[PDB]
Design a protein around this ligand. Structure first.
Ligand SMILES: *[C@@H](N)c1c[nH]c2nc(N)[nH]c(=O)c12
Ligand SMILES: *[C@H](N)c1c[nH]c2nc(N)[nH]c(=O)c12
Lengths: 259, 261
């Protein structure tokens, strides 16, 4: 199989966004940061090349890109000769931008760019160590009702317990999520229960993050909010959706333990 | 309802099946282990709150069986909705079930995520052989590429490549790995070695089997006095396998992940 851009399948952001009661004018800005761990092609003499791709898709794009289709598209590079690493980057920018509907950023990095890079955890307070009982696994947004009754604060919280399901594969999705906000202080137990209630919930990573953002916004009414999740890869690609009131991109992209 | 804890999901594969194709001797030419990293290990505590961890498993190369990866993933997924009273119980069950499957005692570490903060991404030892100006048009497996490959003065060298790719036979899907070869013997021609490794690109075999094939081909064609072949493959469905085979060494010094892992 040679290089084949037709393998890419877009999915519109509007599907879920409509389900969240969002207008065309978004409550958030942001991007989906993808890591492509398996990018490989042939040089111009047929010798294999390997790299890690770092891609950013703007949250304003009409479409996200379905992950398996992205994987299959990348696999079409594997037996294809390209003139130079610059040609690979150019082709990726062109094809991914066309699919998403807006210019996509792409960095193609040699493997030695990662030597001695440290694994990171998230920022602020981890909310996971709570002695509490969970009596059911059904998604409930109302777990956030009255969750922010505290004094005005600015703080950053995170959890490693985010799990959702990938319906189109009927397989688990695993993520950590960081929530930074300015507003009435949030009840930690409510937030953790809310996140745990995704466990049996079918949704895409991008859609889950938008749901978390919009639920926090409507129940907790912070003045400023950023939600950033880092999910473990599916088929050699991971997705790290970032949604913020004021921020366009995260100021760090670094892999976590399970990624 | 999701399937809860189910050891019957584990699928053993006898190692001897593929080893027969390698025409080995009565006693194994190598020793070693298969090191697995389980990046998605999660279960519920007794009060129902999720727990997350990374597992590290070592299966002796002398075990009667290896464990089929997809079955291992499904087995691990069966923990996800299951309540366990302690992390110790989880580690204990993993040792018990995986040892029973493999046919020999396996080691299992269950590590909290904080144990990985600041841990490095690593490369392999020795010299990378990948930057060569040569043309490859034929990706079919050919072990004869190693014929007369070691002409050199007797040396001790460590060589590695990030270009190992094979196909995963259940799915046919591509497998991606780096491989580290340490030997003492006549110096190996690096073009021949790289062409040989690249010839796996269209080839169907398990990671463990590919490493054993590389070891046995180098042994028969290059006749080094001592040899170690160690490959580290990217994960499939949340689990990776890192087969280590050696004439004189038992195991690698660490499980540290590489860039694509
Ligand atoms: C494909 N490479 C594949 C599929 N199942 C596997 N199990 C094991 N133990 N090794 C593999 O390489 C496997
Ligand atoms: C599973 N969660 C899944 C399957 N395909 C996907 N594509 C994208 N863009 N996001 C996901 O979470 C996906």
């Amino acid at each position: 199989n040679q290089y084949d851009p037709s393998l890419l399948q877009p999915v519109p952001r509007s599907l879920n966004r409509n389900d969240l009661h969002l207008s065309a004018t978004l409550p958030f800005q942001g991007c989906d940061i993808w890591t492509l761990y398996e990018l490989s092609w042939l040089n111009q003499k047929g010798l294999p090349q390997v790299a890690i791709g770092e891609v950013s898709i703007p949250a304003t794009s009409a479409n996200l890109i379905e992950s398996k289709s992205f994987k299959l598209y990348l696999n079409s590079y594997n037996q294809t000769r390209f003139a130079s690493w610059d040609e690979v980057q150019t082709r990726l920018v062109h094809d991914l931008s066309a699919c998403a509907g807006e210019t996509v950023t792409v960095n193609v990095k040699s493997l030695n760019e990662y030597t001695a890079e440290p694994i990171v955890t998230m920022q602020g307070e981890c909310i996971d160590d709570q002695d509490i009982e969970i009596a059911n696994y059904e998604f409930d947004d109302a777990l956030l009702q009255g969750a922010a009754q505290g004094e005005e604060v600015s703080e950053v919280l995170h959890s490693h317990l985010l799990k959702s399901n990938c319906l189109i594969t009927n397989q688990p999705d695993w993520g950590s999520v960081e929530i930074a906000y300015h507003g009435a202080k949030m009840n930690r137990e409510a937030l953790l229960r809310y996140l745990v209630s995704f466990r049996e919930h079918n949704e895409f990573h991008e859609q889950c993050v938008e749901r978390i953002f919009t639920d926090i916004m409507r129940y907790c009414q912070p003045q400023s909010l950023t939600v950033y999740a880092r999910y473990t890869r599916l088929g050699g690609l991971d997705i790290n959706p970032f949604r913020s009131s004021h921020q366009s991109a995260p100021n760090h992209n670094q892999r976590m333990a399970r990624q």
